[PDB]
Amino acid sequence: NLAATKMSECVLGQSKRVDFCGKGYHLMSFPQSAPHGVVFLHVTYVPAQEKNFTTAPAICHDGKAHFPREGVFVSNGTHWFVTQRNFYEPQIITTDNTFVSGNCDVVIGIVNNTVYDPLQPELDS
Amino acid sequence: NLAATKMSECVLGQSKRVDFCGKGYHLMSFPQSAPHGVVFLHVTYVPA
Amino acid sequence: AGTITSGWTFGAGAALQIPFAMQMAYRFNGIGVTQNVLYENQKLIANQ
């Protein structure tokens, strides 16, 4: 039954269950025949190399609070970047990436920062 | 095996399965050892 | 320990330290409640 489920969930689709498909964020599996049994060749994503960064749940442009739509805030030390969770790619924190919620007073950990607005250059230019 | 899955899925990550992690949208769980068994503290979200 | 400091990542491979308050933002993200809920009521949630 477990085998069927694995075949059902792992082969037929990508299973969400942690450690169902093998250690790690599961990609996919290739079922293989065997005597009186089955063997699966799971393909799993495992993070290789890492780097520390300094984080804060938000940033204040105006004195208002910004949270990341997708990602977490980090900094190279000089500048703050927001990136995805499992593979590092920094991005310029713009309004396009961020969403509004509350003000600076409540936030815990929020840091002052500057958010880039793509609109301004269009009108001024 | 059920226990292992609970640690595997529920502890190690956050489970999507309704009524797997305790009644509610599941947040997380902390296992605690016990004699010949294990106790979980499923922390779940429930609307008030 | 890994569950607290690293989030879910410790199951996948190398555990990655992440501040706890951040984890709930993910965990709330897991249910369909955006991060803004947690921080906006961070103290209460912790107290609860």
Add this chain to the structure above:
Amino acid sequence: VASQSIIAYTMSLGAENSVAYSNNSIAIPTNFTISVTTEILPVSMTKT
């Protein structure tokens, strides 16, 4: 082959580790790996 012997010891739980937990820092991986592991399960007994 040398002066080999049988040893008994307290089994190592593994290399012990620790996570640099902090209010303000995250560990985000730069690169990853695509690995493959084998999970083996019995399907059927011999039809005796």
